[PDB]
Every structure is written in structure tokens, then in C-alpha cells.
Design a protein around this ligand. Sequence first.
Ligand SMILES: Nc1ncnc2c1ncn2[C@@H]1O[C@H](COP(=O)(O)OP(=O)(O)OP(=O)(O)O)[C@@H](O)[C@H]1O
Ligand SMILES: *[C@@H]1O[C@H](CO)[C@@H](O)[C@H](O)[C@H]1NC(C)=O
Ligand SMILES: *[C@@H]1O[C@H](CO)[C@@H](O)[C@H](O)[C@H]1NC(C)=O
Ligand SMILES: *[C@@H]1O[C@H](CO)[C@@H](O)[C@H](O)[C@H]1NC(C)=O
Ligand SMILES: *[C@@H]1O[C@H](CO)[C@@H](O)[C@H](O)[C@H]1NC(C)=O
Ligand SMILES: [Mg+2]
Ligand SMILES: [Mg+2]
Length: 1958
Amino acid sequence: MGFVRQIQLLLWKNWTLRKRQKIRFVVELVWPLSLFLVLIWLRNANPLYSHHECHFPNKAMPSAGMLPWLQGIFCNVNNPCFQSPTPGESPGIVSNYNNSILARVYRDFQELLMNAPESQHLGRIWTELHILSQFMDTLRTHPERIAGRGIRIRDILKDEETLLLERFIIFSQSLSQGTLQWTLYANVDFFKLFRVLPTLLDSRSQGINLRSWGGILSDMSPRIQEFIHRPSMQDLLWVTRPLMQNGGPETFTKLMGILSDLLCGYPEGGGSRVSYDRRTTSFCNALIQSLESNPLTKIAWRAAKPLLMGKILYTPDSPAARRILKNANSTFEELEHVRKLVKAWEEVGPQIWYFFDNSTQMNMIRDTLVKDFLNRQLGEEEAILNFLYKGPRESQAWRDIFNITDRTLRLVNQYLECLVLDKFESYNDETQLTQRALSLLEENMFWAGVVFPDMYPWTSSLPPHVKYKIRMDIDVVEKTNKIKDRYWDSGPRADPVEDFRYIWGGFAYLQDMVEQGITRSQVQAEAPVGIYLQQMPYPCFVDDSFMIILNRCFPIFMVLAWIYSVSMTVKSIVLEKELRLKETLKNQGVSNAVIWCTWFLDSFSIMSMSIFLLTIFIMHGRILHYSDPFILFLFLLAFSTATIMLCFLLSTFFSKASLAAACSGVIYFTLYLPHILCFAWQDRMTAELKKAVSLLSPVAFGFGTEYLVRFEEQGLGLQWSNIGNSPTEGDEFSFLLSMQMMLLDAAVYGLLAWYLDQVFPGDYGTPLPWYFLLQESDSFFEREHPGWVPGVCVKNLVKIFEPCGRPAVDRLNITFYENQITAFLGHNGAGKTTTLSILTGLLPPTSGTVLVGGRDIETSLDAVRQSLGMCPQHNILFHHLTVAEHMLFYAQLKGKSQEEAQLEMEAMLEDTGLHHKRNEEAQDLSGGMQRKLSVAIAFVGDAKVVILDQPTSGVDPYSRRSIWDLLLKYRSGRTIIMSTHHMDEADLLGDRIAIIAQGRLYCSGTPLFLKNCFGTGLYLTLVRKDVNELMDVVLHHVPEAKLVECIGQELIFLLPKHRAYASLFRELEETGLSSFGISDTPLEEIFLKVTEPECPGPQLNTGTQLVLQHVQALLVKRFQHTIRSHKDFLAQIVLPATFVFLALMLSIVIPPFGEYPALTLHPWIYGQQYTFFSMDEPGSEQFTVLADVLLNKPGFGNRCLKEGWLPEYPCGNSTPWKTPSVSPNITQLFQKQKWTQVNPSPSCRCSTREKLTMLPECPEGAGGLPPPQRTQRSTEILQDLTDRNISDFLVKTYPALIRSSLKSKFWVNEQRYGGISIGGKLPVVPITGEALVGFLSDLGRIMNVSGGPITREASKEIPDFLKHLETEDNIKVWFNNKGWHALVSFLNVAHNAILRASLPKDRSPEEYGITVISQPLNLTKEQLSEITVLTTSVDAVVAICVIFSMSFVPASFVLYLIQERVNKSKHLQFISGVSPTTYWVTNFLWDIMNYSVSAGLVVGIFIGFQKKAYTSPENLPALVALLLLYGWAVIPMMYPASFLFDVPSTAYVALSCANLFIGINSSAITFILELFENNRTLLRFNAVLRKLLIVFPHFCLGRGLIDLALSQAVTDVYARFGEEHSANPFHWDLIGKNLFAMVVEGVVYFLLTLLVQRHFFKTDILRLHELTKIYPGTSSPAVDRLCVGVRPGECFGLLGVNGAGKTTTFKMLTGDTTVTSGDATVAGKSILTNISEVHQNMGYCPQFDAIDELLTGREHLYLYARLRGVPAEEIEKVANWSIKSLGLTVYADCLAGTYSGGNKRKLSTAIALIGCPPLVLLDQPTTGMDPQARRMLWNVIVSIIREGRAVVLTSHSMEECEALCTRLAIMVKGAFRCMGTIQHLKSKFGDGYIVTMKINPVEQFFQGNFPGSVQRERHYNMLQFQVSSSSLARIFQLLLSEEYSVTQTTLDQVFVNFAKQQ
Ligand SMILES: Nc1ncnc2c1ncn2[C@@H]1O[C@H](COP(=O)(O)OP(=O)(O)OP(=O)(O)O)[C@@H](O)[C@H]1O
Ligand SMILES: *[C@@H]1O[C@H](CO)[C@@H](O)[C@H](O)[C@H]1NC(C)=O
Ligand SMILES: *[C@@H]1O[C@H](CO)[C@@H](O)[C@H](O)[C@H]1NC(C)=O
Ligand SMILES: *[C@@H]1O[C@H](CO)[C@@H](O)[C@H](O)[C@H]1NC(C)=O
Ligand SMILES: *[C@@H]1O[C@H](CO)[C@@H](O)[C@H](O)[C@H]1NC(C)=O
Ligand SMILES: [Mg+2]
Ligand SMILES: [Mg+2]
């Protein structure tokens, strides 16, 4: 139950302390919500994009004819989406190329010219022309009548008459004209005719057909003119305009567009697109080289070359293979027939030129014709526009149509000869084929390599099941080890380049050719069926653009937000431990488990609020949109628990906070590194190995975060229904396993932390054995009175400290009895605190035992601590609480009611003198009040043993009275142990006394026993203000000894005969010295008997030697500091480089590279699946059998042959056709409302703006009714889609099918991959074969060409040529591109069915088949796309790790600067004169050489791993200059921060985190924003940021480390193909600009730190005038207006009550704090204006030790001599004098941090006197010094006062302010109360004779003898008494009966009642 109360109190304290910060807390719970702001914005920069449907054009294969094959290659290069069903996916069409102008032209030509009433008589004209040219024109070699000649003759003959002429000649050139001319009317006029048509004049089989030739042209006149003006011809001529204009169009910009709309037609704009070579011609190698070396067409040529010019290598040399590949080269045969035809031109051309130059039928017929009749004949429907425009015979400027023909038709012949059309080479082994392929690959002249495995080189007969292989290289083939993607994306997979490697790589074409060869080799009656391929359409979907960066940034940004919390809690666990605040709590009796429970609750309650805020931002910021808030909350909660218990585990390794701040973040982030292995071993990990590694909590976090992201990139969330099932196929270890294996780690970490705490409590506390689970649960010394009881007992201790060697404590034997106070005295290095640290469990002994209640602490500390109280020598308080809160907290921890605690606190506040504060923080107290509170809270509660040492060192004589009252009130029932130095109280209130010397007792017992043990006598005191006089004056009554002590302004005499003594004092009274005082024997004389030069500085250096001495001094100081703390150096310098080393070592382990397997291609590589078919175009025989042999007899493919196929996929039976039943609502819906042909079914609603979905909803009216189904023997479901809209069915049914796949197996699946569709016709050119060649032959015979030798070969192959450009009857296959190997599988299905559908009717088609196999060529490679992404992914994280590492080193230099700024050790060096510039410059110079070691170590690692892009002969200087100049730039940026943090560890943590935040969120935003080149507003931001963000060195390093890595991948990919460009990474665009910004920054920030340093920094000396100091938070002044002056040779006093303003004055004088309204002058130089000038005329000794705890005592003196003049050859004797004079010989070199606490004061005053400054300021120079050392200090001060130097002291011991001081000044709250000499005070204040006795019976003893008395005190067996000035005290001394004592007046009693009265 008390457990719960203590929990509540601890939590109350923590939350009270947090109520004061309100900034360390807000930053604490806001820091993680800050790494996500970039993502929150960058999400809303990119709203989601919804994509329309896609419909794609089909692809003809080589077997579909050459013309559509090539046309499809050209038109469908980019594979465009069309959004509306293309014509090719209609039941009986394949064409898909209308709206092409070249096709509409044919449409109009068939519609108008031909098949009409104008083409009837045209052939008759041709036939009559041929008859003419055969009969009348050709009349030379044949016999005829006289009227005949090759040109012209006359038949004039048979003349019987004798032999006007012009008239007849004109007239002939008339039937009734010659009849009346008369003879010639009976012989030559018999059958004569006129000039009419003589076409009837010949002897011909037909009568005549003339007078119709010109009378048929008018019929077809309105047809041609109509045609030419049709819109199709307008478009043709419009687009052909920029072709013949001067020859040559623009290369690939508009030429492609013209050819596109000329051949292709695609609408809506063209779719969306989602060395001297040998055996060649000097043209063909010039062309290829000009094409390859043009950096614009190298890419397309790189892919097109192996098909145009590559070669195909086939393995065995057998007649079977030769036959197959003879039948497979049909395509190349019909491709070289074209070359033949075009080559025939080089022969026909000159013949046509001649015929149209000379002709008997043109140049002698048409040039000879006359024109009178022609003009009228033309006009009745131009000779000048015809017979001259096209019939010229001599040059005129007809050639316009002939000299473009050769230009355009010989260039084509030059082009076509570059093709290689013989490409089948024959080998005898796959090995030989492989080496020849290796040879050919470099030239890029390797197509595939075909292998027939089952046939031997003698094979002749084909088996009826042929299998072959196509072996290509991996860069043009899909991988054969996996068949799909790892995760189901939502897209069609339709990128023409990287998703269609089976098409542009040439695999599918060769497979088609060889399947057709195999079919044609064993059928002999093949069906001419061709094949088209069609891609199944895809619905509308939603694009992301975001989960490409989200999935690569989420599980870094999520694990990196907790690094600040981890560091701030591991550091806070360790501050309490090494600041000793855990041990005070454990001393007040707080259990050990309450500590841990409070830590856990207080950490959990703070992490749980940032968890909440983080979830709210993650969801409402739309980073995750589909998931569940509650599950995310619970996941983060489990992580919080794991991380907290990890922090508890880590805190038990460290003891110093600065060391834990430097390791916690690095270790937290190095436990996450094993997630590098997820890049290479992505698939070869197992759920069991995944469990084994998830014991490290961050990797379990990463495993869970990946599922969180992935369930969303698959369109779902983390709903409560799919935790336990992974998204990826066939892997265990779901999300729940990560969540559940976080809690196992929480438990394990916590349990181990609890155990490991007990065994290794470093540096404060007692360890346990590693097996503590065996469950234990004369004479010097006074005679011992057998009475009271013993309390604490000590028995033979030893404590050896390892370095020092000597025993600090050596065999003690003491007992402290119960009901009394003991005083525990000794010199300084005695063992008083080392012993009292052992009685309490602060540190373990080397030997011996102690016993508190008879129970030894070696086993029973828990019970001992239940009743303890303690105050330590140096204060430890919660520096932000209050006085009242301290006392109200410790009182209740012991267990008390709240109101009783109020009462006790109220009493003790007044009792201790700490009232009037009661509300001030424990840091605004002075240093005596802190020591006073530290005692007050040792008595509160109720202890039984109270151990309190040095309880009064620093408290003024007026408050020591209250402390004594407090001690004597609680002595009643406790054992109290006091350790003290000043002896006024060691005897007054000590019931016993013990003394230690060198770590063991020297004496013991009650004080009276000690006195007679050593000696006793009176002590005559003569306080002066000449020795010979006194000596002779005390010779008259010469006793024992004489002068025993004589220091400045003091004296001492010892004298053991009433008249003798009586006469002395009496006579002395009336007869140079001032007052005096006799006594019995002090307690300081017996303690004093137990234990038992450089006055000028000549020539202090100055100038450049002084500066060069300062630099050396500081560098040596820093070297000494860092040699002795090497764990800190290791953990701050070498650790980050080790982190980098681990990160690079991990990215080296990679799986070995095997080889790509076989993978027989068939549709059952996939699982259960649907297929379909569609028997379009029925009734045609030869298709009713092809639709029968792919359903019923063997079915699809080869999974059911007669013998067997692959005994891995067994058959079975089938089921009857069965149309499934549908719900009635559909039945009424589809018949009720009338639909149409273009709208068969209701449409699907997409993913609305506010209705986000992955795929549309598609209501219950999808593409129709369910079609008939069946289950085939292949264990597949094919559904018959005959006479239905397939494009509608597939599109509107894909979504509902994708949902029905994750109900059972939670991973989404694709259940449909393809199907056949029998039918499809395209119209073949109606022109037959032999008819064409006959027409050509007749035309040639008319036109006198006769051809030539080439033409007979060219025109020998026309009939077969025209049969191979079209097919007219063919099928088409549909495929789904999501499955990689789904194209070739179904292509094989189709070819195999075509084979079975055509073999004869007695061969049983169930045992014939073809199978294909892929098997890449053994080149030992990977695909480029794989290694590129792997390399960039790995080499990004290396840059991330280097940035993380170099972000921690720069903050490591602030630890020393902050550590020195507080404790006032930097100010104490400025006092010696170091001129801030040299200090800062030297620190910078040390930091640089400290940094360069880490930089060099990182570089050495990069060299060792041989990482390119970093260690290459062109990059290494760039890397070195990046690192070495980043450090220069960034180091002087931490320095201004050392001015506002007080705890070094806090600064370390808060600066490392800020550096990491900037260095991550500057070098990722500009690499993400540049990735998005789509958006235009992003480029503005990217450009402006890449310049604004240059002021941070973090950006300048983050850019460069990733640039040098990106700009080497782009060259190592070039090495794959082509040339190899170098880097030169120094350009003013890569890193050259950053390296310039570094240098400017590195010198602008240093000036900023030197500027911020400046905002913070008569015959007498030190004249003070009215000066004041009001502290900011109060109302009354700390130091009111005060004014003095000190002369050269005096010593000022500066006494004062506790809390009066004495250290504030010294702080203002030395220049620490800021004066308020005053002035002060040291040697003429004022302190307000020029203070660097006064600083060299004074020394300073602070109240608190300002020393470096790691050098030594001697190295301090050397440092502080060098920081002054004292040239290099004198420092040794100055140091030796200072060491010897102050008493530091035993331990002059022992690590000043191990001094005792009275030796630290000696060191401080020793280094306050180096040099010889005229003014010396000392502040409490003697608080922990024993009486032996105080005298040595007094002697030194007297020796320096005698020179002429001034001293100012501030002390609280009045034994010395009257021994060496000349002027005093009591100082109450503000200014002074009473200045003046010592005698000026005593005389006016206090008569004298303060008689003190020891012992009612003595109270009445001063009734008549001494009436005037006034009582001072009434204590225990000691009490004081003031008696009036009677001078008869020694007279009445014979009336006593005790401790004799009387004195004139001590200054101690004067100061008590001086301050009593105010
Ligand atoms: N940082 C501070 N803020 C507010 N008040 C302060 C601060 N430091 C000191 N004081 C107050 O100013 C007064 C002067 O304190 P100062 O340190 O001069 O006392 P002191 O005489 O040096 O004490 P002691 O004599 O024990 O050394 C004290 O009352 C103290 O409470
Ligand atoms: C040309 O294509 C159009 C486009 O739909 C089609 O309607 C027409 O039937 C086609 N003409 C043919 C193939 O002759
Ligand atoms: C036609 O081009 C040829 C070049 O092949 C040229 O010699 C001839 O002169 C051109 N025709 C005319 C009419 O000039
Ligand atoms: C190709 O590599 C595979 C890898 O195992 C090996 O089995 C096969 O024999 C090799 N064949 C050739 C022709 O290199
Ligand atoms: C559709 O028909 C079903 C019966 O199958 C009926 O329950 C429902 O009310 C009808 N209307 C709808 C679903 O809008
Ligand atoms: Mg001590
Ligand atoms: Mg002080």
C-alpha cells in the first residue's frame, strides 16, 4: 500500500517540475509530428487521377500475310488506348484500318470507276488496238497488197493511160467529186472510198468498231471529274503536298505523320499511349554507321538491327530440321521477290525511255498527227497542251514524270539490298551455337537460336509430337524463374517498350514461323488460316503517383520519429544516476521497484499523447485513406511499450550521461539495419527466419509497416478481418505476428534490464554476485564503559583506490554509542568522507565490515536504510523545486500526513533561519542557505542514525547558533555522527571525540580525557595593533614555555602561584598591544600537537610571443583532457564510422546467381482459370472441324494426349453444358426495358471524387446473362460466348471477378488469361495471278519493250507471290498481359489446334502436337531493369547512413564548451587574459583536426569496399573535398548554441536531432519534386528551393552524396551498350557550386560566433562609488549603494551575515554579471567600459571550485603560468614555490578531480596568485581547511601584504579576520553598517570578560559576586556567561566548586550580538 503512496508522490514531483518548463515538454510531444509535414503537403500537391477505359488494336502475325504483318508493325508501335471499341473486336472483322485515306480512295475507285456502265467497251478498244498493231501497223515482214509499207506507200498501178496536179494533190488530201470529172471511173473507182473512217477498209474478222472510241469518252467524262473532286482525293493531295517539294521531308517529325494518316487511320488524334563492315556495300555500311552514331536514332536502331540483319542458328543437321526450316522461310522468300521486282527496273527503264523517245507508234504516229479534225473532235466533247506538254522530242526547258521515277526507284533498290534474307546456319551442339552467338552479339547480329532436342543428326522422319526450344538472350525475353508480379497492381500492363518484349524482341514472330513450318511439314494439305492477336480490354481505374514514394519512405520516416524520445529518456535515466539523485531517494527509504514503476508510467503517459496526435494527423491528412484508426493506434502502442523497455535496458550500460547521449541514437538506429537484406533476399526469406530476426524491436516495426502500406496499395485496409493473413502469395508472418512479437521483446528486454541492474551498478553502489538468485531471504583510547549500547560499529576497514595506490582508509576500529553526539576530526586527506560514504552504501569497501544495528550492510542495506538520514559534504538538491516543497516532499516520503507535514515544515523553517524565502527555487539561494537547507532536511521525518558531515562549513557565527540548537533538540534518541573542522563546536557539544590520521585512529574519548592525554595549561593572548619587551615582560613571572605562535597582527603565550599569575594580569592591565584573554586549554592546541621566493615577476611576455604562448597552453590543456577520457573519444569519434561500416558490410551479402530454367510454355502455368471461345462465321466448312478439335477431342493444348504429357498435370472427366441460374430481378430487367445494339447493358459507375474506389461498382446488370459453361478435362471452365458482345462482357465483368478471388485466399488473383475466337475475314485483292502477267506481257508487246534476262526471273514467281500477301480466313487469340507468359502460351494453343484441324481423316488428331520451351542463352547476366533498380535502391541507403553518421559528430564538440562555461572555468581564463578571439580560434583549430579523423576513417572504408562512384580515380578528390569542407562549414555553427544550454548532454541530443532533421528533410524534397516533371507548379518550387536551401551545409552534403551515386549508374548502364562517358564531377552544376557555398558559410558563421561572444562579454586601488544590483525577478536590491577605497598595503575585511551580497559584489567587480547604476575603478580603469584592462591587474578566487577535474594539480599551475607572462624557462620554479608554500606536496599530481575538498581550496588559492597582481580578491579561501593549513595561508597573505599589494577577504571564521585584517565592514542586506578598524568595533560594542564555565547552583553563583551580568546562552553541560568589568574574575576563581575561561572580547561574540539587534 505504501508502494502506491510513494508512486503518487514521485509522480507529483515530476509533474510539478514539468509545470515549469512548458517548452522542453511541448517540443517533446510535437517532435514526431514534424517529419510528416512534407508528406502531408506533398499528398495534397497530387490529387488522385482516374483513368478512362482502354481498347487496343490487334497485331497480325507473320502467318497472316506479309502486308498486314508489316502494316501492323508500323501502325502499332506505341500500342495506343482508344476508349471506344475498335472495329477489330467485332464478330467477323480483323481489318481495323479504315479512315485511312489510301483505303477511302480505293473505296471511291470501286464505287465510281469500276463495276459500272462505263467499263464495258474499254476492253474492246484495247483488243481492237492490238489487232491494229498486229495487222495494219505491222505489215513489213508479212505479204500484202501494194497499198502497204512500214511507213507509207501507194497502190497506184494497173494503168492503161498516158502520163491540175496542185489542184488534185490538194483535193485528195469525194465519192461524187470524181464522178463528174470525166477514164478512171471504171478501174480505179471500183471500190474506192472517201477520206471517211477507213477502219472498215481492212479485211478483219469483225466488221468495224470505230466511231465509238471517241463516242465512249463522253460517257465516262462526268465520272473522272467527279472522282477527282471527292473529299478523299482532296485529303490525299493536301497531305501529299510536302513530299515532292524539292525532295525530302523533315526526318522523323512530319514524315511519320504523313505516312500515318496515309496508311494507318487511328482516330481521336492517334491514341493515348498509356568500322568498315564486310560482305556489304559502301552504301549499306555508310548508312548503318551514320544511323548508329547519331544520338537520336541509336535507340530504335539498337532494337531493329537484329531482325533486319541478324541470323538464326539451329542446332542439329538432319534432313528433318532442314525440311522444317525450308518450309519456315516463306516470309523471307516473299520478301526477296520484292527485291527481284524492283531490280527489274534497271532494265525496263531505258526501254521505256527509248520507246517514248523514238517510236514508230509515238514519234512517228502521235508526233505525226491532221490536227484540223483533231481540234474539232476535242472541241465537240488541247493539242498544244498535249503534244507539246508531253510529246516534245528536243529539250525545251514529259520528263517531269520520268526523271523522278528513276530518282525514287533506284534509291529504293539501293536501300533494299542492305537486308539479310538468308539467315539459317546449322551446327552440331548447343555449345558451338553458344560461342557463335557470343561472337555475334557484339555486332548486334543475333536473332534467336532454335534447338530440336529429340532428333539425332541422322533423323529423317518426324515423330507426331515435335518439341523445340528458342534460346535468346535475357534482355529481349521475359524472365523464366517467375511468372507474375509479386504484388497485384491495378493497371493493364500495356507499355510498348518494357511490357512487350515477346513482340519487339522477335520471339513471337519466330515461334509463329516455326510452328507453321512444323505444321506444313506433316500435313501436305494445310489450311491457309492466319492468326491475329488481340489484348483484352480493361475497365476504368484510379492512378496513384504516390505509393511509389510512399512505399520507399514510410518505414524510415516512421521509425525515425522516436529517436528524440529514445535519446531524451536514456539520458535522463543516467543524469539521476551519476548526479547522485537516485541515492538520496534510496537513502530516504524509497524502494528500488518504485523507481522503475515511476519511470515507466511517466514515460508511457508522455509517449501515449504523441501517439494520439500522430494517428490523428496520419488519418485526417489522407496519407492512409482505407485503413482503420484503432488498429494503427494499437500497433503504435505496442511499439511504445517495446521502446521504453529497450531504453531501460540501455541505461544500465552507461554511467556518464554524456556517454549515453552519444550512443543511444546510434544503437537504436543500428538495430534496424537488417532491413537492408530485404533488397536482395526479397523472396528467399522464410516466416521462421522472419520470426528469428524480429526479436529486435525496430525490425518488427518495419515488418508491420510494410503490411500497413501494402494492404492499401491493393485497395484495402487493415480491417479487423485480414490481420493474420498476408497480402503476398504463400507467405506466413502476417501483421498480427509483428504486433505479437513486439510484446515478447518488451518482456525479454525488461526482465534482462532488471537482472543486469543488480549485477553492474557502476560507480555508485554495491554489486551483487552474478548468482544472487540463491535466495538468502600514555594511553590514547579511553576505556570502554560497559554501559549505554553501541550503535554503528566499524571493524577493520580498508579502501584502496586503484590509481593512487595508497590506502585512503587503513584498518579502522570505531564504535558510535547510541544517545550522544560524536565529533569526527582529522586533517584534510584523512578519510572522513571516504569512511562516511561506506557507512551508507555509496561505495563498497575493500575489506572489513560495518554494523548499523548489529546487522552488517554487506547483506542488509534495505532494512538499514529504513531509518537513516544524511547530508553530504557538497550540496545536492532538486534545483527547480522550492524550499517549502523540498521540506514538504521529504517529510511525506518517510510517511506522514499532509497537515502534520505542514506543521513540521512550519516549525523547521523558523528554526533554521530559512523563513522569508519559503518560495524561492533552490537555485536562487546563496550557498550558506543551501548548506543550511541540506541540514534541515536531514532531521525532517524521523531517523535513528543521523550521519551528517561538514554541517557548518559556510555558515556565519550568528546562524551556527541555530544549527547547534537544532542538533541539541534531536539528540534525544538517535546516534548522531558529526565531521567538522573548526573546534569551537567539536568540544562544546561533543559527547565523544575521535581523531583520524592517515586513515586510522590516533586518539579517542571524551574531551577531558584528551586534554590530560596530551597536555593542559593557560594561554595568555596579546592581540597587537616589540617582541623583546613582551618576552622580557613575561620573564618576571617566567613559567614554562613562551611564544608558541606569532602571525600578522596576533600573538600567543603559554603559561601553566596565584600571586605570580594574579600579579601579571593585574600589572598588565595598567601597563603596544590592545586587548587579551586568558583561558584553560583550547581543543585546537591538542589537535595541533597531533598532526605535527617569487615576490616580483620581471618581464611578463607581450605581443606575438604572448599569443603564441597562449595557443600552446590551450592546446596542451585540451590534449591532457582527452588522453585521460578515451572512452568518450572512442564513442564520439569512432562509433559513427563503425555504423557506416556495418551498413556497407550488410549490402555485400547477396544470394548467388543461378541460371534461368526452361519453363515449358502452356496455359496451365497459372492455376484454375476461365477461358472462352466464340465460333463466329458459322456454316463455313473447315471451321466446324476446327471448332470441334479445340473443344471436344483433344481440347485446348496438349494436356490430354493419347500417350502422355508431363505427369504433373493429370486429366479427368468433363461435365455437360449448363447455363447457370440468375436471380429473377435480372430476368425482368433484361426483357422488360428495351435496350439497343450500342447499349447492351447498364454502365458501371467509377471512383467518384468523394467515393474513392479501386475499381468501379458495376451494378447487378453487368454485360448480360451468364453464358453457358462447362468444365473441361483440362480442369478449366470455358464459357461459350457465341453471338454476343465480347468487349462489353469482359469489361463489365472484370471487377466482379476480381472481388470473388480474395474471399478464400486473401491475396487478389487474376482468373482469366485468354481465349480463341474462330472466324474473321478480310477482303483480298480480286486481281488473280496469270491474268496480271498476261496483261503485262501484252502491254509490253504493244510498247516494244520485250523485257530482258532479269525480267524472266522476276515475272516467273508472280502467281505464288500474290498468294502470300493476304489470307482471307483466320482466327484471333485474346490475351491478358498481367500474366507474363500468357501471349505465347495461347499462341501455341492456336497453332496446335490449326495443325489438328487439317490432317487427313485417318490419323486420329489426338496424338499430334507441338510444344515450345524458352531457355535464355547462358551469358551469366541479369536483365538491366533488375540490376539498375537494385543498385539505386542500395546506394540510396548508403548515402542516408553517411548523412546520419556525419550528423552526430559535429555536435560532439559542444560538450566541452558548455562544461567549461558553467563552473566558471572559462571566465577564470579570461581573467588571466586570453582575448576571446584566440580562445575561439584555438578551439576551432582543435575541432578541425578532431573531425578529420572521422572523415578519413569513412573515406578509408569506402576505399576498402571498392565502391565505385566514390573511390575511382576521377571521383575520390570530389568525395574527399565534400567531407573535409563540410566539416569546416558546419563546426562553427554549433558554437552559438553553447551559449544557451547549461547541461552538455541536453545540447548534444537536441543538436544531433536538429541536424538530422534538416539533413533528411532538405535532401529528399528536391529529389522528390524533381521526379514529378508532369506538374508545372512543382518546377517553380524546385528551382527556387535549390537556391534558397544553400545556406545549410546539410543540403550541400545531401545533394552531393546522392549526385555522385546517380551519375555513375547512368554510365554503368552505357557500359551495357555503346560507349562509356567519364564523369569529371567538378562542374558548376554537379557539386562545384556546393563546394563554393561551404567556404563562404564556414567563414560567415565564425564571425557570427565572435559577434555573439560580445553581447555576453589617489594613492589607492579599487575605488567603489554608489553601485547597485537588482536581480531581474525581485524588487529589493541585492547590493544597495555602497562605496569604499582600498590603499596599497592594507587588507579589507568584508564580513557579513549569511545572504548579504558578498559574492554579488565580487561578481560585479570581476565582470561576471552586469552592474546596475554605479561605477568602480581598479587602477584608473573603469569596469563599466574597459574591463580587459583591469583583468590583468587582479587575481580572483571563486567561492566554488572552478577547476578541470581531469588534469592534475601541477598542470593547472603550468597552464596558468603560461596564460600570463613568466617565460618558458622560469615556470618550473614558480610552480614549485606555489606547490610547496600552500602544502600540496603529497599529491601535487593526482587528477584534481580526486582531491579531497579541502585540497581544492588550496589549489584555487594557489592559482589565484600566479603572476603578482596588485589587487587580490579572495572569496571564502578557507572553508574546508583544517587548522594546520589555515596557518600556511595566513603566512602567505602576510608575506604578500608586506610588499605593497592589496587583499580583500570574505570569510566566516572570525579567528582569522582578527589575525590578519586591518579594516572591517559588517554588511547587512544592502550596504555597510559599520566600517573601521577592529578596535573601533570592540570598544563601542561590548564591555568584556565573557566568562565561560562548563559544569541553578551556578546560576545563583553570580548573585553578589557579579551583579551586572547578562546571560548569553544556556546549553547542555556547557554554558556561557557575560560578567561586568570587575577585573576580579581571577580574584573570585578560588570560589569555583569545569573549564576555566575568560577573555576581554572575541570578535566572534561581537559579531553575534552585532547582528542580533537589527
Ligand atoms: N541568480 C539569482 N537570482 C535571484 N536572486 C539571487 C541569485 N543569486 C543570489 N541571489 C540572492 O541575492 C542575495 C545575495 O546573494 P549572495 O550570493 O551575495 O549571498 P552571499 O553573501 O554570497 O552568501 P554567502 O555569504 O553564504 O556566500 C541573496 O539573498 C540571494 O538569495
Ligand atoms: C471501314 O471501317 C468502317 C468503320 O466502322 C466500317 O464501318 C466499314 O464497314 C469498313 N468498310 C469496309 C471494311 O469495307
Ligand atoms: C530529268 O532529270 C535528268 C537527270 O536524271 C536530267 O538529265 C534531265 O535533264 C531532266 N529533264 C529535263 C527535261 O531536263
Ligand atoms: C546452361 O546453363 C545451365 C545452368 O544449370 C546448365 O544446366 C546447362 O547445361 C547450360 N547449357 C549450355 C548449352 O550452356
Ligand atoms: C430485385 O429483385 C430482388 C429479388 O431477387 C428483390 O428482392 C429486390 O427488391 C429487387 N429490387 C432491387 C434489388 O432494387
Ligand atoms: Mg570530506
Ligand atoms: Mg557567497
